[PDB]
């Protein structure tokens, strides 16, 4: 059944230029720039065209949708082939994603440390040895079965470290210490094992199919949108760009039904808000993550 399609009433432009922003609390400056506001407004446009086609039956699978997001994002890359290939390629089962918690991901470190669901564990490291780490272990539940996802760790014996790290550098050379930190920095996100991605993809086509219904109340539909956005962003299915892509999909599904969601709230980097939360936590909080203030 065809759907109303994108709204005619459209976010004021101050908002459209925030669509997709990474409005880090600790440096919203980058949200304020000309090039970005260009990037975001581009996104807001390719979303809506995609919405147009969802509402008509042109996008059938969440995989075809994700193609529409991927396609868009690359067209915004002025970088080169080693960078074009990552944003274009699905993460595969013979590899492990990692994100060092450096900058701009320095705000996160508090979010893990004061997280109510945070553990206190030990990270056994061949160079620093044994370390205290506050740990969050995002998990998802599906068909009943538990899925582990991303794993936030923050080393806390911070004085040892700066002392230890300086130690280690002169021996192995910066060359071989950076090697370790690229893969074993004490503070780091260890992402959803790529092996889960086959099934997480079926579940996301199931989820998309339902939300392109025509009978859905305003509450459900959103509850569907928040989920999709949660599952994509948290599985991080592509080597690069998953963050944008996820938000692209979600917002395209919203405009299909004629909804015109706003930019997320400042300091609410949506992918990370979803990585540090369970499914139903995030479904509930979704509405307030959006700057729905007049």
């Amino acid at each position: 059944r065809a759907l109303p399609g994108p709204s005619q009433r459209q976010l004021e432009v101050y908002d459209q230029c925030l669509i997709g922003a990474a409005r880090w609390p600790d440096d919203s400056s980058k949200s304020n720039t000309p090039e970005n506001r260009a990037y975001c407004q581009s996104m807001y446009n390719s979303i809506r065209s995609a919405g147009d086609e969802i509402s008509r039956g042109g996008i059938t699978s969440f995989e075809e949708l994700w193609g529409r997001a991927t396609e868009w994002r690359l067209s915004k890359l002025q970088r080169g082939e080693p960078l074009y290939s990552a944003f274009a390629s699905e993460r595969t089962s013979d590899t492990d994603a990692v994100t060092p918690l450096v900058k701009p991901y320095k705000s996160v470190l508090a979010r893990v440390v004061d997280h109510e669901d945070a553990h206190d564990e030990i990270m056994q490291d061949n160079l620093f040895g044994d370390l205290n780490v506050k740990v969050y272990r995002q998990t998802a539940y599906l068909h009943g079965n538990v899925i582990p996802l991303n794993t936030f760790r923050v080393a806390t014996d911070t004085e040892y470290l700066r002392d230890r790290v300086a130690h280690l550098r002169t021996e192995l050379g910066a060359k071989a210490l950076k090697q370790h930190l690229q893969r074993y920095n004490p503070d780091r996100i260890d992402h959803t094992n790529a092996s889960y991605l086959p099934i997480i993809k079926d579940h996301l086509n199931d989820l998309y199919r339902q939300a392109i219904s025509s009978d859905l109340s305003q509450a459900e539909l959103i509850s569907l949108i928040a989920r999709t956005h949660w599952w994509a962003a948290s599985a991080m299915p592509d080597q690069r760009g998953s963050a944008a892509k996820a938000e692209f999909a979600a917002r395209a599904i919203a405009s299909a039904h004629g909804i015109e969601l706003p930019p997320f709230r400042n300091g609410n980097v949506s992918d990370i808000e979803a990585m540090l939360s369970g499914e139903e936590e995030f479904v509930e909080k979704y509405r307030s993550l959006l700057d729905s203030d007049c």
């Binding site: 994100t99 450096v102 014996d157 503070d187």
Partner: peptide, 25 residues
């Protein structure tokens, strides 16, 4: 004690903050 992650000051070997991809050991 330093801030969390501020143990990694002025190190030339400080990681680059973005998603990396390695071979499964």
């Amino acid at each position: 004690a330093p801030k969390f992650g501020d143990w990694d000051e002025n190190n030339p070997s400080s990681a680059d903050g973005y998603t990396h991809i390695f071979n499964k050991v």
